[PDB]
């Protein structure tokens, strides 16, 4: 028999609905490519049983903690099943925006000014030190959970009083949250596939930022691929993303989000080590520009597994 | 029945023999403490079977990659067994000295000047930029694998022409290697147990550095607990270790290694998230100074598990 592949999709994160759609697309692409692939939802199926169930390899189409944060990767490593995407460390680090930012800053790479807060600090009241650091960011700011995706838990803050409500929202999702200087844009994303950096994308939301609706449920978001930069700036963006990728230790495939600010410089937002694969998703757009069918894309991601 | 605890020991890393000794001590301390503990060696026993075998919780007494680097933690998380020490991210990060250093530098914490190299770069010939960066460290330097323990693969380089052999040695143990400025010492270590920072230890090897023989097989190494610092410097050391610990995201217990340099300042070397527990080991020494039996120590570590 040829290899039986499990496409892991759904799960129980805030990105479940997106993952169900990513997995649906991946499953079809793999079967179209001649791969004996089957959908497996960890919400329904105990994933510690995959090997016992007869699977040879795993395509990870989960998003968020418990699929994308090193935990599942560790289990698959010990079970001895090859799997797509980054290993334990790089998956855990890429999920943790606070620690990605620290790593990248330690490496001399460009990141937006920011303040990190814990839920325990917020509950008690912030120090004068922290309040001064927050004030120095100016307004607006963006507030985000450290370990989410799909713009879950995020908001733009334009008044000091409402920072509290933005923090409360983000703290529903994580015990660690980031307050970041608002960047002017424009916004970009760059997909990586093995050793190939795919054509860049410029993303233009119709509203204040690339929120959940703008990502998955809007026909108003615009996309430009390649991004339409001057050749030197496209080279600058590619070199930045490659250094960010290598600094985190990522492998296989992924997507790094970047924005310009008013100073004309690129800033790193985050890396994603199990990117969206839906009809609205960005890695498929870059791959299409690179002359790949969606089927060719997913077969390639699978071939790259250990 | 009351809970059956698996003490994981041995495994297949370069630190196997240390781990067999750590686990032997932990097993006895747990049983003296009234805990129904059993030794389980992942070299002999399929660790994916622990829950099936009837275990309720796991005491990790493994050292090195595959017990200490987040992989096993991920498996245990998905199996649903509580386990001792740090989670997936902090274990993976603490094992990766290169990425710990970047994280800590990003956070403004003191780390020795260094250069990181990959094995592929070394095989081809280093760039002029890399050669210039190595020269700027001066001599002597220490060379270490990124992801080892127990001083495995490490050497001091006092002459330019001996750097290549030191690099070749370290590259036997990891594909990523660090060249670091030689620090004058003295050398310290600080153990963390839950929220408690234990009494500091000053370590005085008889030779060039605290090598494998000095760690595990010598009656010549000297230890001072507490470290014998002035009150203000002891406070400084504790504050630095606590910030390093929290920046990594570690939990449960662990030990951070620190050295003075000739400027009189402390520099962070690394964190260890599954510390040695042998008769030569440091966490037990700190615990004894804090008025605990070894049995009380390991019972507390186990109580702290998820
Ligand atoms: N500092 C900032 N200033 C302005 N806009 C921002 C900033 N940070 C993030 N954004 C906006 O918020 C969106 C989501 O932020 P980010 O990519 O950091 O987190 P995410 O929720 O993990 O996204 P993903 O779906 O890619 O996983 C960005 O695509 C961008 O539109
Ligand atoms: N930059 C340096 N200068 C001088 N000595 C050093 C330096 N870095 C490390 N050492 C020496 O080498 C020893 C081991 O280094 P380090 O703690 O970084 O790695 P390790 O192999 O993971 O140790 P462990 O058994 O604690 O896990 C230190 O205890 C110290 O004696
Ligand atoms: Mg994301
Ligand atoms: Mg209010
Ligand atoms: Mg639609
Ligand atoms: Mg994003
Ligand atoms: Mg170590
Ligand atoms: Mg002895
Ligand atoms: Mg050490």
Looking at the fold, whether A96 and A233 belong to one and the same domain comes out as yes
b/e A1-29 (16+ beta carbons within 10 angstroms → b): eeeebbbbbbbebbbbebbbbbbbbbbeb
User: Could you give the CA distance from residue A203 to residue A211 in angstroms, rounded to a whole number?
Assistant: 12
Neighbours of A299 (CB within 10 A): 18
Q: Is B150 a catalytic residue?
A: yes
User: Could you give the CA distance from residue A200 to residue A148 in angstroms, rounded to a whole number?
Assistant: 23
User: Could you give the CA distance from residue B227 to residue B240 in angstroms, rounded to a whole number?
Assistant: 15
Strands B201-204 and B155-157: unpaired
b/e A97-121 (16+ beta carbons within 10 angstroms → b): bbbbbbbbbbbebebbebbbbbbee
Looking at the fold, whether A149 and A229 belong to one and the same domain comes out as no
Alpha-carbon gap: A227 to the closest alpha carbon of chain B (Å): 30
Inter-chain CB pairs, A–B, below 8 Å: 99
| Interfacial residues of B (vs A; Cβ cutoff 8 Å) | 47-48, 69-75, 77-79, 88-89, 92-93, 95-96, 99, 101-107, 247, 249
Instruction: Name residue A53's beta-bridge partners.
Output: none
Q: Are A225 and A199 in contact (CB under 8 A)?
A: yes
Q: Are B33 and B286 in contact (CB under 8 A)?
A: no
Ligand 1 in reach of A148 Cβ (< 6 A)? yes
The DSSP H or E segment spanning B233 is helix B231-248
Question: Where does a domain end: A183, A215, A240?
Answer: A183
Strands A4-8 and A57-60: parallel
Instruction: Name residue A193's beta-bridge partners.
Output: A196, A253
Looking at the fold, whether B211 and B269 belong to one and the same domain comes out as yes
Looking at the fold, whether A104 and A205 belong to one and the same domain comes out as yes
Question: At a CB cut-off of 8 Å and minimum separation 6, what does A233 contact?
Answer: none
Q: DSSP assignment of B25-93, as one string?
A: HHHHHHHHTT-EEEEE-TTTS-GGGTTTTT--EEEE---STTTSSSHHHHHHHHHT--BSS--HHHHHH
User: Could you give the CA distance from residue A284 to residue A289 in angstroms, rounded to a whole number?
Assistant: 9
Q: What is the DSSP secondary structure assignment for residue B227, as one 8-state letter?
A: -
Looking at the fold, whether B221 and B298 belong to one and the same domain comes out as yes
Which residue range is the domain that position A54 belongs to?
1-84
Looking at the fold, whether B32 and B169 belong to one and the same domain comes out as no
Q: Are B177 and B144 in contact (CB under 8 A)?
A: yes
Ligand 2 in reach of B272 Cβ (< 6 A)? yes
The DSSP H or E segment spanning B266 is strand B266-272
Instruction: Identify all chain A residues contacting B121, using CB atoms and an 8 Å cutoff.
Output: none
Q: Please tell me the residue having the least CA distance from ligand 2 atom 14.
A: B151
Q: What is the DSSP secondary structure assignment for residue B262, as one 8-state letter?
A: T
Residue closest to A78 by CA, chosen among B62, B100, B171, B54: B62
At B161 the three-state DSSP class reads helix
Alpha-carbon gap: A198 to the closest alpha carbon of chain B (Å): 24
User: Could you give the CA distance from residue B282 to residue B279 in angstroms, rounded to a whole number?
Assistant: 9
User: Could you give the CA distance from residue A96 to residue A88 in angstroms, rounded to a whole number?
Assistant: 13
CATH number of the domain bearing residue B293: 3.30.470.20
Q: Please tell me the residue having the least CA distance from ligand 1 atom 9.
A: A269
Q: Are A224 and A201 in contact (CB under 8 A)?
A: yes
User: Could you give the CA distance from residue A219 to residue B73 in angstroms, rounded to a whole number?
Assistant: 42
Ligand 1 in reach of A180 Cβ (< 6 A)? yes
Q: Is A281 a catalytic residue?
A: yes
Looking at the fold, whether A30 and A122 belong to one and the same domain comes out as no
> Residue A210 Cα, ligand 6 centroid: separation in angstroms?
8
Q: Is residue B3 left, alpha or beta, with left meaning phi > 0 and alpha meaning psi from -120 to 50?
A: beta
User: Could you give the CA distance from residue A29 to residue B128 in angstroms, rounded to a whole number?
Assistant: 45
Contact assignment for A93 to B93 by CB distance below 8 Å: yes
The DSSP H or E segment spanning B136 is helix B128-136
At B10 the three-state DSSP class reads coil
Three-state secondary structure of A151-194: CCCCEEECCHHHHHHHHHHHHHHCCEEEEEECCCCCEEEEEEEC
Q: Are B277 and B25 in contact (CB under 8 A)?
A: yes
> Residue B17 Cα, ligand 8 centroid: separation in angstroms?
13
**Number of C-alpha atoms within 13 angstroms, CB side, residue B207?**
12
Q: Are B30 and B299 in contact (CB under 8 A)?
A: yes
CATH number of the domain bearing residue A70: 3.40.50.20
Looking at the fold, whether A4 and A53 belong to one and the same domain comes out as yes
Please identify every residue whose CB atom is under 5 Å from ligand 6, which is an ion.
A 257
Question: Where does a domain end: B128, B153, B183?
Answer: B183
Q: Is B148 a catalytic residue?
A: no
For testing contact with chain A, the best of B106, B120, B243 (most A CBs within 10 A): B106
Looking at the fold, whether B62 and B134 belong to one and the same domain comes out as no
Three-state secondary structure of chain A: CCCEEEEECCCCCCCHHHHHHHHHHHHHHHHHCCCEEEEECCCCCCHHHCCCCCCCEEEECCCCCCCCCCHHHHHHHHHCCCECCCCHHHHHHHHCHHHHHHHHHHCCCCECCEEEEEHHHHHHCCCHHHHHHHHHCCCCEEEEECCCCCCCCCEEECCHHHHHHHHHHHHHHCCEEEEEECCCCCEEEEEEECCEECCCEEEECCCCCCCHHHHHCCCCCEEECCCCCCHHHHHHHHHHHHHHHHHHCCCCEEEEEEEECCCCCEEEEEEECCCCCCCCCHHHHHHHHCCCCHHHHHHHHHHCCC
Q: Are A238 and A190 in contact (CB under 8 A)?
A: yes
Q: By what technique were these coordinates determined?
A: X-ray
Q: How many residues does chain B have?
A: 306
CATH number of the domain bearing residue B124: 3.30.1490.20
Residue closest to B183 by CA, chosen among B268, B255, B117, B108: B268
Q: Are A278 and A285 in contact (CB under 8 A)?
A: no
Looking at the fold, whether A6 and A49 belong to one and the same domain comes out as yes
Looking at the fold, whether A149 and A281 belong to one and the same domain comes out as no
Resolution in angstroms comes to 1.4
Q: Is residue A175 left, alpha or beta, with left meaning phi > 0 and alpha meaning psi from -120 to 50?
A: alpha
Neighbours of B138 (CB within 10 A): 10
Residue closest to A265 by CA, chosen among A139, A113, A145: A113
Strands A4-8 and A36-40: parallel
When divided into structural domains, chain B yields a total of: 3
Residue B126 CB burial class (10 angstroms; 0-12, 13-18, ≥19)? middle
Question: Where does a domain end: B68, B84, B100?
Answer: B84
Looking at the fold, whether A101 and A161 belong to one and the same domain comes out as no
Q: Are A303 and A85 in contact (CB under 8 A)?
A: no
User: Could you give the CA distance from residue A221 to residue A130 in angstroms, rounded to a whole number?
Assistant: 36
């Amino acid at each position: 028999m040829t290899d039986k592949i499990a496409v892991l999709l759904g799960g129980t994160s805030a990105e479940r609905e997106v993952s169900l759609n990513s997995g649906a697309a991946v499953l079809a692409g793999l079967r179209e490519g001649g791969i004996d692939a089957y959908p497996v939802d960890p919400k329904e199926v105990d994933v510690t049983q995959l090997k016992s169930m007869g699977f040879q390899k795993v395509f990870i189409a989960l998003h968020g903690r418990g699929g994308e944060d090193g935990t599942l990767q560790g289990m698959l490593e010990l079970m001895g099943l090859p799997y797509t995407g980054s290993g334990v460390m790089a998956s855990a680090l890429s999920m943790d925006k606070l620690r990605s930012k620290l790593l990248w800053q330690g490496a001399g790479l460009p990141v937006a000014p920011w303040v990190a807060l814990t839920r325990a600090e917020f509950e008690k009241g912030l120090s004068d030190k922290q309040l001064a650091e927050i004030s120095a960011l100016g307004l607006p700011v963006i507030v985000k959970p450290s370990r989410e995706g799909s713009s879950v838990g995020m908001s733009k803050v334009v008044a000091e009083n409402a920072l509290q409500d933005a923090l409360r929202l983000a703290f529903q999702h994580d015990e660690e949250v980031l307050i970041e200087k608002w960047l002017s844009g424009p916004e970009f994303t760059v997909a990586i596939l093995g050793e190939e950096i795919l054509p860049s994308i410029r993303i233009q939301p119709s509203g204040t930022f690339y929120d959940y609706e703008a990502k998955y449920l809007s026909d108003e978001t615009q996309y430009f691929c390649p991004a339409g930069l001057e050749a030197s700036q496209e080279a600058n963006l590619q070199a930045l993303v490659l250094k960010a990728w290598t600094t985190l230790g990522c492998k296989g495939w992924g997507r790094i989000d970047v924005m310009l600010d008013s100073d004309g410089q690129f800033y790193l937002l985050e890396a994603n080590t199990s990117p969206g694969m839906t009809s609205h998703s960005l890695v498929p757009m870059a791959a299409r520009q690179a002359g790949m069918s969606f089927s060719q894309l997913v077969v390639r991601i699978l071939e790259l597994a250990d």
